[PDB]
Amino acid sequence: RTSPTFRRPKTLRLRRQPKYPRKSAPRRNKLDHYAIIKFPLTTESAMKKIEDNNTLVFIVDVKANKHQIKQAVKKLYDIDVAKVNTLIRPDGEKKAYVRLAPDYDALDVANKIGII
Amino acid sequence: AKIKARDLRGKKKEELLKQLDDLKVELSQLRVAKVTGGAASKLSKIRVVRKSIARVLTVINQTQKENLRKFYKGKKYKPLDLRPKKTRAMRRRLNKHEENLKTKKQQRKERLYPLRKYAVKA
Amino acid sequence: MKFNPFVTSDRSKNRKRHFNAPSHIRRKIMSSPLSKELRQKYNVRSMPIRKDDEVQVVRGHYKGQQIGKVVQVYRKKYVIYIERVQREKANGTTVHVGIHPSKVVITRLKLDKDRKKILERKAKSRQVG
Amino acid sequence: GPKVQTDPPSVPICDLYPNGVFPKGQECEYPPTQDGRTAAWRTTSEEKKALDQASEEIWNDFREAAEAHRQVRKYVMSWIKPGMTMIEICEKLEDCSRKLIKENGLNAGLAFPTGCSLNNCAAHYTPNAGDTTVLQYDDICKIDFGTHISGRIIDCAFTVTFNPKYDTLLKAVKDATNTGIKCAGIDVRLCDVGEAIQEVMESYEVEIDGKTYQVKPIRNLNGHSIGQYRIHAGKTVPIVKGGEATRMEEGEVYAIETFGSTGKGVVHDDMECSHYMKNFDVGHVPIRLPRTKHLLNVINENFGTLAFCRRWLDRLGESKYLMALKNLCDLGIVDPYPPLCDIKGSYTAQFEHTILLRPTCKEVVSRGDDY
Amino acid sequence: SMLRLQKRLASSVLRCGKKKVWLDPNETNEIANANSRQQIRKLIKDGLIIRKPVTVHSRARCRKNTLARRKGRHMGIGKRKGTANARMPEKVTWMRRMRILRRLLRRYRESKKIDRHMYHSLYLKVKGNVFKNKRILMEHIHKLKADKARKKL
Amino acid sequence: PRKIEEIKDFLLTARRKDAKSVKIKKNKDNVKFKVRCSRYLYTLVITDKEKAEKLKQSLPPGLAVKELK
RNA sequence: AACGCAGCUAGCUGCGAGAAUUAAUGUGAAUUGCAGGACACAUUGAUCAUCGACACUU
RNA sequence: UUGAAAAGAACUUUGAAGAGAGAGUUCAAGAGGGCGUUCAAACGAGAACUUUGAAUUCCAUGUGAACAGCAGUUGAACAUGGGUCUCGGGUUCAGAUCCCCGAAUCUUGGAAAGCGUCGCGGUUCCGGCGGCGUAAGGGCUGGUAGCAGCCGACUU
Ligand SMILES: [Co+2]
């Protein structure tokens, strides 16, 4: 012993091998693509954003994030997305602004959805 | 035209998934019609579609639990959910076997001196 | 007199139970007497009223011997509407007048599989006694 | 010789009548009930006749429109058959009318889109694009269409049936319409006309499927008064009792409409809107948007104050216009007229005629052998 | 009939206040229709809305008085309200004198009009308040040089 | 931005794959060539008209040429 | 304790992203302020009661 | 705490309305919804007070019961809709170092943009195209008690 102090020795630690699973089955995912997007918006300030700077306006779930929103909109409508901007409205709702890629055009896509 | 639980009980797992998918897409379309001008007929369909979705999900969730009930029928250890609930105090009391055991000393007294039936004439 | 320990004769309890009853219970309360000719045929004094039964009114302003068809059974207000019992509103429009089921007599009855079974059940009870 | 019409109508009306004088209507005396006396001086030449002469030019346009309408309805009646889609029927009728009328912008054309309504539906239904509705044997159809010459409009409608069972209902509605036309007169209270129509109509009964219904009027619907370039001039003729006591006047044009229903007798809105019109009272409202101002330009340059439908806008070549139209309706410039329907399983019938009340007599311009 | 909105948009578009906007008195109905910035831009281009000129504040009177005061017209003994030190700080007067009389002495040294040894003596006397002006100093230097020349001869 | 000083260097940079377009501006006293690359904008200033016209012809094939003037 | 859920809906009441309710069993033609929609009613069922299967945000 | 039951007062007539006079239902309304600083103009039914010219309260539209210690054609009042996404230029009825374009982390940027003025089309549509312009107190440079020249505010 070259030091005047005594320190606790190191010992073998083992991993868990449970004999039964505490929960029978994994919980179902309750935030899927359909739940992400509540509906689209048709107000007077949303109709100026489609015909000028190629964007779509949506109402989404409060607990979603920009990454989840981009995947959901892509899968449902088979479109490309560049940027998402989000704000929480004063009444407690979340509004997302999505910008389409240059190849795509908002006007035809919006007509397919039924918005315009 | 009408979704009844009895019809869907014996169908295959994949077939149920497709029906759930189609119903969800119908609901999303109806929601778009609510924000714009909507026909009285269209608005009233929302409640029918919403109940149909719940009905299919009940069948899916119910079927999967009996599959797990059979798998653990004879195993000593079961998942916590699959065990009986009752009450917390009831789960702590002794089982039927333990409650009626007796010592060797008590058994001898019962054999030697059984109770009798008698009547006193008067 | 009433001798049952677990039945109440209180005025306030009976009135509360009558005004606040589930819809299935209100069907039993709304019953009407059967006509003399029908009574002999089926040996049944009374039957619960239904949407499509012929009826005659025996009390009130509209008392008569005409026969009408029931058109709507309103259980919330304990009333029924008949074909020609009606008065005119100020505009010139016509409105139906509610009649309590106890003041009408059934002349002809709707016949369905379930109704035939209720009629049979009532007939046996009397004969046993 | 005098131009004769071809089997499929194609000659314009003006060619068939080069001189200028078009066929006349059915002329009858005014109702003799005038509080105990008759004005038989109205038939003789007087200052009334002098005033009447001053309006012969106006009457000619109405007679021309009536002739075109009669020819179009005669053509339509021949080939109508079950199994065809309603879009084809509407397109054929519109093309035939467009050819016979010889439309010249706002000089001539169709006042409103043709309306074909089935069963419970009573008015204001025309198939939009993408509609797949086929006529059935057990169906009742109402065809309403109109034409105008220089702002003089004619509105008439009839009912077409196949199955014989609806005969009694059609007869009752036709009788009520005829009685209403008979009662109409100058300086007569509208309420009396409504009472007469209701009393005549209520004395009828029908049996369809073996259940016994009573023919009763539809209280919501009513007649109207016609003006130049304005289909509704602000007067309504009721078909029921209990109403205002406005009086008719000479030189006025009226449409007498009767609707019959074997149901409750009230109508609500059930389906997608298809008819739009521009508001005559409104002035200048700031639009504040690029595309809806193109919409309003097109509207002002093709239709004016006459009604239009979405099929017409599609034919003009416009697309993606729904939001602009909705904004216009919200601002109050344009007004949407939605379809009116009765309870499911009910049946309806509609007969309408346009009459001119002249200073000297009463002329039923739309009258023809057919009805 | 009320034009509150149209007098606020115009001021923003013209980058001015609401006291410099003129609205046509006889064209009120046409102006009332405008409701957006795009329409306001159209009416300014058409003459209906104009920007009024700035009010005039001329400096001509004070420029004349300054020219008179340059020759001392309004200075006097009855027109001064502050102390002499307040009007001109005596520290500034001293500082200017030192720089003027120290720059002159240096220049003479490069041109070899004076030697370093005499230069050091004059520098300390300037610090002692002996000399007041350039003229007073140069005269002393000329007088000193003459005395040295005569002594040799 | 960056300033190129020699004509040859302008050719080498333009060949680069990142280069997206060339814009030519014709001022009264000079002609400027500007190439838009990934990170920077490079400018060549030619002061004589005759040399500039020769240079324009031999611009790298496939780079979209936009004439601002 | 909080926040959500109705065709038109603030509060009270009921419920929990299956959100004024799903399944099962009794019963047996309604609910209702207005509209729409159902429903041989047993090629199985509107509505209410009960409740033992399933589900249950922070 | 209306009435047995809304059968809750159609229609005519005065007034801008609130309010009335006739009618109508009911056994009963002697039961009627808490009931057994100056001058002009405009808009408006109406101007001492609103607008123009001359001396969640935010933002639109609509109203005038109640409130704003006088009034109100007005409102922070009442009803219905909408709005918060490392530099330089655009853009809204209401948001921008956050949206769009462009550059990044003396000269290249840079005149192509911005700002003045003068014009040409157009009228709920063109957000469209051009021409010009930006008495005494001191310095500096070139060379016997120094001079040549320009300059330069203030003070006693
Ligand atoms: Co008509």
Numbering used by the authors:
A (entry chain LX): 41 to 156
B (entry chain Lh): 2 to 123
C (entry chain LY): 1 to 129
D (entry chain A): 108 to 478
E (entry chain LR): 2 to 154
F (entry chain Lk): 2 to 70
From the paper:
While this crucial step in protein maturation is executed by two types of methionine aminopeptidases in eukaryotes (MAP1 and MAP2), additional roles in disease and translational regulation have drawn more attention to MAP2. However, the major determinant for binding to the tunnel exit is the MAP2-specific insert domain of ~60 residues, which is locked in between uL23, the universal binding site for nascent chain associated factors, eL19, and 28S rRNA helices H53 and H59 (also termed ES24L).
In the human complex, HsMAP2 binds in a rigid manner and could be well resolved at a local resolution of ~3.5 Å after local refinement. HsMAP2 binding to the idle ribosome is rigid in the absence of an emerging nascent chain. The catalytic core domain of MAP2 with the typical pita-bread fold is mainly involved in charged interactions with the backbone of 28S rRNA and 5.8S rRNA, as well as with residues of uL24. Most prominent, a conserved arginine at the apex of the insert (HsMAP2 Arg395, CtMAP2 Arg361) stacks on top of the closing tetraloop of H53 (H. sapiens C2526, C. thermophilum A1582) in between H59, eL19 and uL23. In the absence of a nascent chain, as observed for our human MAP2/80S complex, MAP2 adopts a rather rigid binding mode.
